[PDB]
């Protein structure tokens, strides 16, 4: 469960990322596809090449979901409910894959936030992404 300090750290990283969040979401997906090729199976209909408008658009969607979670950090289960249904019920996304994308999201923040990405903030971000992932795999039926 996220602590007050974690919530503060996550909000601060969010603020520093600012309007780049969408671009960063796309970068994290690209890193995930190149680094963990098995994840590409979920996007057969996507052109996953660098510069793909589809990956760019999807990155913005991922980013928006994450900012919705930080904006309602005290009740992510509720805020992320519809997305949880989609990833588990319709997409059948393997739970292991959330760890892969969460790692790529951390790597992306690290490559873009020299001052922000301290060990403490790194730990807070990891907890937050783990929290988000827990909610998105909570709907397995």
């Amino acid at each position: 469960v996220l602590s007050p300090a974690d919530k503060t750290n996550v909000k601060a990283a969010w603020g520093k990322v600012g309007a780049h969040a969408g671009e960063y979401g796309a970068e994290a997906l690209e890193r995930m596809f190149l680094s963990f090729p098995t994840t590409k199976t979920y996007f057969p209909h996507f052109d996953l090449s660098h510069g793909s408008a589809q990956v760019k658009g999807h990155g913005k969607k991922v980013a928006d979901a994450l900012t919705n979670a930080v904006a309602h950090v005290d009740d992510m289960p509720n805020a992320l409910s519809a997305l949880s249904d989609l990833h588990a019920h319709k997409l059948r996304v393997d739970p292991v894959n959330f760890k892969l994308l969460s790692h790529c999201l951390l790597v992306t923040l690290a490559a873009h936030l020299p001052a922000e990405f301290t060990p403490a903030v790194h730990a807070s971000l990891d907890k937050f992404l783990a929290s988000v992932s827990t909610v998105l795999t909570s709907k397995y039926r």
Binding site: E27, E30, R31, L34, S35, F36, H50, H103, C104, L106, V107, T108, A110, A111, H112, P114, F117, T118, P119, A120, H122, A123, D126
Partner: protein
């Protein structure tokens, strides 16, 4: 594992820029901060009560230097990671009983540390090359469990 010439190029080029007296300690420190249970294996290291204490802890920095040395040894023998890591595998598996998931975690923290240090230079293709490497080292270090 097998890296392509382009991936071996991506890896070797970046590694020559790494400060080998600091990156290991940074990775080990973060491993202990981000994944607290790992502190269980370092009861003799002293003050690990706060992130700052962990990162500034002299023993953590010194030990991290040893860990980095091992990654360097692996980067030098990418086509024989198993032989290179045989002795460390016996130590971490047979003697220490560290769960192998933590080998993957340390490798990923190292990747985060490299991304932090190199920024834009640590491109998606460069990261991919490094993931093959840390996955390889983790698998080699876990050979004794297999």
């Amino acid at each position: 594992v097998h890296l392509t010439p382009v991936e071996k190029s991506a890896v070797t080029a970046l590694w020559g820029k790494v400060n080998v007296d600091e990156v290991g300690g940074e990775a080990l420190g973060r491993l202990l901060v981000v994944y607290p249970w790992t502190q269980r294996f370092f009861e003799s290291f002293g003050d690990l009560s706060t992130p700052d204490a962990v990162m500034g802890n002299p023993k953590v920095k010194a030990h991290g230097k040893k860990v980095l040395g091992a990654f360097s040894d692996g980067l030098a023998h990418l086509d024989n990671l198993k032989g290179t890591f045989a002795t460390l595998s016996e130590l971490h598996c047979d003697k220490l009983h560290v769960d192998p998931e933590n080998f993957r975690l340390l490798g990923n923290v190292l990747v985060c540390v490299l991304a932090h240090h190199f920024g834009k230079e640590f491109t998606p293709p460069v990261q991919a090359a490094y993931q093959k490497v840390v996955a390889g080292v983790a698998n080699a270090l876990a050979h004794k469990y297999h």
